[PDB]
From Swiss-Prot, chains A, B:
Homodimer. It comes from Haemophilus influenzae (strain ATCC 51907 / DSM 11121 / KW20 / Rd). Belongs to the SspB family. This is Stringent starvation protein B homolog. Enhances recognition of ssrA-tagged proteins by the ClpX-ClpP protease; the ssrA degradation tag (AANDENYALAA) is added trans-translationally to proteins that are stalled on the ribosome, freeing the ribosome and targeting stalled peptides for degradation. SspB activates the ATPase activity of ClpX. Seems to act in concert with SspA in the regulation of several proteins during exponential and stationary-phase growth. Also stimulates degradation of the N-terminus of RseA (residues 1-108, alone or in complex with sigma-E) by ClpX-ClpP in a non-ssrA-mediated fashion. One of its GO terms (biological process) is positive regulation of protein catabolic process. It comes from the Bacteria. GO terms for cellular component: cytosol; ribosome. The chain holds residues 5 to 110 of 150 of the full protein.
Length: 106, 106
């Protein structure tokens, strides 16, 4: 059956937003297919602000996360395969979850 | 902040339905406020079919689960406080999750 990760991710995103937290996503920028600004990658990882105000056309689908965001005032489109989403947490207090490894992703 | 249980429950419910599974909910019938047919309770626990075909007016809110269902052809309304939802799983293969204890519920 399908991976649980995208469902847990959307569920946690909603919990975070409903509690007034800013949703931060930790991404493995080395994962095949990840398309993000390389200059912001630190040790092969990048943390992205997924709040409504900081993103444009946010999509949290089963296979990927996609949206527009500004980096130094320049709007850019990011594409993150679901297998590259490692965890999601509140910027304010670190509460959230790290997704469990799922065979289909590796 | 608010309990994560109702969000994980709705997320797992959707994953189950999307994978063609029949969502079964394990409930602690001894929990205060639970309103279910006592004659179906086994050892203080009751398992309920939450599929769309088997329920009427299904509500999965943050504080409770409510819906109409037939027992021996007689329609009855069930009310389950979220603190009484112990786990949710697929009737077909048992895949699902048991919710973690959360202080606010006990
Ligand atoms: Mg926006
Ligand atoms: Mg129905």
């Amino acid at each position: 059956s399908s991976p649980k990760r995208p469902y847990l991710l959307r569920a946690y995103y909603d919990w975070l937003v409903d509690n007034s937290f800013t949703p931060y996503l930790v991404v493995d920028a080395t994962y095949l297919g990840v398309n993000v600004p390389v200059e912001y990658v630190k040790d092969g990882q990048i943390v992205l602000n997924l709040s409504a105000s900081a993103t444009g056309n946010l999509q949290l689908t089963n296979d990927f996360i996609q949206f527009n965001a500004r980096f130094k005032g320049v709007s850019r489109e990011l594409y993150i395969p679901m297998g590259a989403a490692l965890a999601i947490y509140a910027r304010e207090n670190g509460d959230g979850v790290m997704f469990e490894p799922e065979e289909i992703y590796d």
